[PDB]
Amino acid sequence: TAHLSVVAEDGSAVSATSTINLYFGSKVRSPVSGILFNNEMDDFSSPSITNEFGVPPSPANFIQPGKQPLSSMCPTIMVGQDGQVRMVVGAAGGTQITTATALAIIYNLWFGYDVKRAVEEPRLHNQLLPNVTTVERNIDQAVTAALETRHHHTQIASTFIAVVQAIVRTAGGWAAASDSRKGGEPAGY
Amino acid sequence: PDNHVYTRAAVAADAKQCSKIGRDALRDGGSAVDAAIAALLCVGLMNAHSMGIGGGLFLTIYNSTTRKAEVINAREVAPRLAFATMFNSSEQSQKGGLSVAVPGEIRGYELAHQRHGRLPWARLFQPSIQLARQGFPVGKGLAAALENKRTVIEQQPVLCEVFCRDRKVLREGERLTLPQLADTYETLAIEGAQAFYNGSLTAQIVKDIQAAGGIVTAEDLNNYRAELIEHPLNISLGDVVLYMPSAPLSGPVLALILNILKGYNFSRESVESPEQKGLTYHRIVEAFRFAYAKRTLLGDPKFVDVTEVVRNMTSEFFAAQLRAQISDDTTHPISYYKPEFYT
Numbered sequence: 001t002a003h004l005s006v007v008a009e010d011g012s013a014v015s016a017t018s019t020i021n022l023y024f025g026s027k028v029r030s031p032v033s034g035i036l037f038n039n040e041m042d043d044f045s046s047p048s049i050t051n052e053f054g055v056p057p058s059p060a061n062f063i064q065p066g067k068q069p070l071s072s073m074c075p076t077i078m079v080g081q082d083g084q085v086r087m088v089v090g091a092a093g094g095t096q097i098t099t100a101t102a103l104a105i106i107y108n109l110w111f112g113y114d115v116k117r118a119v120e121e122p123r124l125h126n127q128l129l130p131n132v133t134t135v136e137r138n139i140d141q142a143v144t145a146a147l148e149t150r151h152h153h154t155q156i157a158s159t160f161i162a163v164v165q166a167i168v169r170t171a172g173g174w175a176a177a178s179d180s181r182k183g184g185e186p187a188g189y
Numbered sequence: 190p191d192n193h194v195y196t197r198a199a200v201a202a203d204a205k206q207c208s209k210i211g212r213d214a215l216r217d218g219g220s221a222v223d224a225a226i227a228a229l230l231c232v233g234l235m236n237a238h239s240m241g242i243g244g245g246l247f248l249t250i251y252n253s254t255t256r257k258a259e260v261i262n263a264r265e266v267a268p269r270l271a272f273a274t275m276f277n278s279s280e281q282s283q284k285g286g287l288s289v290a291v292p293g294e295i296r297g298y299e300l301a302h303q304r305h306g307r308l309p310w311a312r313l314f315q316p317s318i319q320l321a322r323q324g325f326p327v328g329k330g331l332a333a334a335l336e337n338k339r340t341v342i343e344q345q346p347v348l349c350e351v352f353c354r355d356r357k358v359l360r361e362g363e364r365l366t367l368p369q370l371a372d373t374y375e376t377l378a379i380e381g382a383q384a385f386y387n388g389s390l391t392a393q394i395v396k397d398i399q400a401a402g403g404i405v406t407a408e409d410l411n412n413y414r415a416e417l418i419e420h421p422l423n424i425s426l427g428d429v430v431l432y433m434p435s436a437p438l439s440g441p442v443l444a445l446i447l448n449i450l451k452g453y454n455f456s457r458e459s460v461e462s463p464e465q466k467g468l469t470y471h472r473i474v475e476a477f478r479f480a481y482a483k484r485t486l487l488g489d490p491k492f493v494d495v496t497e498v499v500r501n502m503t504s505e506f507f508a509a510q511l512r513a514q515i516s517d518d519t520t521h522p523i524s525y526y527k528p529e530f531y532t
């Protein structure tokens with residue numbers, strides 16, 4: 001998955017998330033065209049496949065011809081009552097896309113972090129099953145402690161949690177941020 | 190500290206070169222959609238592990254003149270010969286041609302460009318054609334993805350063809366060139382999207398997928414259609430509206446998370462001390478858990494009835510009912526959140 005955010009001079013905007021699913025998709029590359037094919041079929045559930053200990057498959061997301069599989073993606077645009085864009089945000093990475101997008105919003109809209117901080121701030125994730133809270137390695141350790149005393153099991157992400165690209169309206173114009181976890185930078189004028 | 194603030198316009202992509210390519214499209218008179226497409230084409234090169242014309246996408250688009258938001262659905266779709274029991278293991282659903290769904294990417298670009306384009310179609314491709322031929326140093330993300338999958342990459346010579354130097358995966362800084370995809374991008378630039386779905390690329394696409402054991406046919410490609418959604422999902426957040434795609438994407442989950450949390454009225458104070466901060470983050474995790482409990486009822490709404498589920502997931506009242514079950518001093522076992530696999 002890859003996320004990108006765009007705001008044009010006239011204030012119109014695009015939030016776009018695109019994906020071939022897992023890293024290098026199906027691992028099938030065309031020797032002639034060079035196209036790398038997705039493995040999006042993996043995003044369906046199958047009665048024959050168990051992905052987590054004790055997790056049954058979800059009938060609503062079973063394969064049928066012509067059906068689209070469920071996705072974690074959620075490219076989002078927030079606009080103010082006056083019709084002007086406030087935030088353009090989305091994420092890539094895994095099941096953690098949705099939670100990371102929520103965090104970016106919470107961080108900017110509520111905690112008051114500027115867009116770069118909102119993107120760079122440590123994240124955490126919980127998706128009910130597995131029954132564990134994953135936190136990034138530089139999270140405030142008082143938070144880890146607050147979670148464990150409330151009986152959460154926490155574990156440290158081996159790498160990083162999701163990838164967020166964002167744009168927010170400021171008094172000085174459009175502030176943009178790309179996530180250092182993947183190595184992006186924005187551009188504008 | 191690394192801020193980037195622009196007076197007129199901005200592109201935030203996951204590679205600097207693609208942000209610049211998007212930015213230049215804007216500067217040359219492109220719409221936000223032109224810029225997005227130009228940038229997406231580039232990301233498919235520089236972060237080829239993560240997206241590209243062999244995949245699918247969703248765009249959320251806001252027009253500041255009409256003040257209307259729309260969504261373009263161009264996610265891949267199960268081929269016509271697919272069926273519920275076609276896979277018996279995870280490896281089967283993940284590797285090889287049978288794991289491939291019908292790519293929607295190019296068709297998504299087409300519909301978006303049809304409705305909102307200003308620059309010519311070919312102009313959107315030119316910078317990436319060049320880039321794929323000239324080559325570029327492998328970035329941080331792609332390098333880590335290469336390392337992560339080095340075994341598979343090194344054992345499959347059609348991938349090693351481009352992703353290796355001397356039998357070993359490319360490392361950060363080393364040059365990656367994609368000469369076949371450059372030619373393919375050029376064909377797309379000149380012949381249009383039709384070349385992919387019903388034209389000169391089509392037979393070869395089918396051949397490559399079936400050769401790898403897949404079942405996508407020409408008819409699947411001929412029949413693929415991106416879809417316009419005129420009324421995407423929204424929620425109110427204070428004086429703002431938030432536009433996001435519904436099922437089959439995760440807007441409904443995001444909406445529920447935020448609607449749960451909004452009743453706590455978070456502000457800067459919520460993170461000013463360790464005691465407040467700890468409770469705030471606990472509350473976030475519990476909102477995640479409730480929202481994920483409901484996620485398992487979601488699926489493609491063309492095939493499953495999710496009307497009522499999504500209505501609940503976006504209702505502030507339903508959210509308030511869940512927030513009232515969040516315990517400030519403890520989390521709970523799985524069943525407390527009432528995960529649901531049937532309505």
Ligand SMILES: *[C@@H]1O[C@H](CO)[C@@H](O)[C@H](O)[C@H]1NC(C)=O
Nearest residue numbers: 048274275276277278281287
């Ligand atoms: C999985 O098993 C079903 C039931 O026998 C069969 O129809 C299908 O072809 C199998 N799939 C694979 C990839 O072996």
Ligand SMILES: *[C@@H]1O[C@H](CO)[C@@H](O)[C@H](O)[C@H]1NC(C)=O
Nearest residue numbers: 220252253254255304305306
């Ligand atoms: C925005 O809406 C106006 C009014 O309908 C339309 O003329 C214009 O083309 C739209 N912009 C884009 C980029 O589609």
Ligand SMILES: *[C@@H]1O[C@H](CO)[C@@H](O)[C@H](O)[C@H]1NC(C)=O
Nearest residue numbers: 386387388389391392407411
């Ligand atoms: C193009 O589409 C027509 C009908 O839509 C079909 O008969 C023809 O074979 C297609 N060509 C390719 C190359 O898929």
Ligand SMILES: *[C@@H]1O[C@H](CO)[C@@H](O)[C@H](O)[C@H]1NC(C)=O
Nearest residue numbers: 258420421422423424425430
């Ligand atoms: C949000 O909710 C529904 C979407 O169909 C619609 O009735 C309402 O007009 C939407 N609101 C805005 C501000 O677009």
Ligand SMILES: *[C@@H]1O[C@H](CO)[C@@H](O)[C@H](O)[C@H]1NC(C)=O
Nearest residue numbers: 497498500501506507510532
């Ligand atoms: C929607 O929420 C109400 C409670 O507010 C509940 O009674 C109803 O079963 C829910 N609908 C679905 C489809 O879960």
Ligand SMILES: *[C@@H]1O[C@H](CO)[C@@H](O)[C@H](O)[C@H]1NC(C)=O
Nearest residue numbers: 131151152153520521522523
């Ligand atoms: C999940 O984690 C919670 C956290 O303490 C615990 O109460 C529960 O027993 C664990 N297992 C399940 C199945 O919920």
Ligand SMILES: [Cl-]
Nearest residue numbers: 002003092203
């Ligand atoms: Cl990304």
